[PDB]
Design a protein around this ligand. Sequence first.
Ligand code: ZN
Ligand code: ZN
Lengths: 146, 146, 9, 9
Amino acid sequence: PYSCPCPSCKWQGSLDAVMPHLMHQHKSITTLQGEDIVFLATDINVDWVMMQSCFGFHFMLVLEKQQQFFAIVQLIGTRKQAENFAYRLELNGHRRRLTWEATPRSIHEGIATAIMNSDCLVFDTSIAQLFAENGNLGINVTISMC
Amino acid sequence: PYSCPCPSCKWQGSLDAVMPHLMHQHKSITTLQGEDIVFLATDINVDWVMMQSCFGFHFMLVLEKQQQFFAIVQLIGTRKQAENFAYRLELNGHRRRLTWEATPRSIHEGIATAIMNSDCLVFDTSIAQLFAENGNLGINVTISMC
Amino acid sequence: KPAAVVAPI
Amino acid sequence: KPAAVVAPI
Ligand SMILES: [Zn+2]
Ligand SMILES: [Zn+2]
């Protein structure tokens, strides 16, 4: 049984019920259509969440500040479905580029475990400041099939 | 006046005298010819140093463990010369890839300043363990002209 | 590319 | 690619 993928919600249910749940009860999460997008997180001085829609699926994009930053992508779907994708997270700044590429986690795997193992893009504040505008950080997120 | 680029040497001199110095007095630093190489650092549980030779120049490749790891590339040359290059550092592991791309520092800039600003590839032990064999970490280093 | 401007929770 | 096997200082 699947739990709410948003990084104060104690909702549980089927996999097919996840998207309806997010749409009705978390109306404030923005969704973007496209396989190559910019996740522009504002005021990095905390969780930011959006959804990216492509290849007929929805991916939850999360940036968390615990200081260190963790950026991760998770498929609203099964592990089997997730294994058909690759995601890329890129920070770009003045003649510097940091890139992280992996298989998206299923929401069943959650992101606590991936975060605790630094299995995602991990960067600290000095780095965040370095790629960021005025406390705004643009992450280029690209999803592809394999 | 240039100081010894090796991460206990208090040598100082001209830029033209740097390479002769490294060759005579730091005979244990390995040099590899090629623009796309693997810097295989052993026993990551500290500094590792090698040199990469390409485009008619020598680049100092450094991995330091302070735990966090810092990987950086520095041109044995001037800032003006360094601005004609781009370097890429890539860790590759099971369906995960971390990449850092930037302009190499001149040795006059040193690497203490770049390291302290996390202006290089920065990854922590859990990540190091993740890309590493049995306490051995392969860094793919690629240098290109721009 | 499309961009989403995202505020913090 | 050529590889260098590097020991720690
Ligand atoms: Zn919920
Ligand atoms: Zn020396």
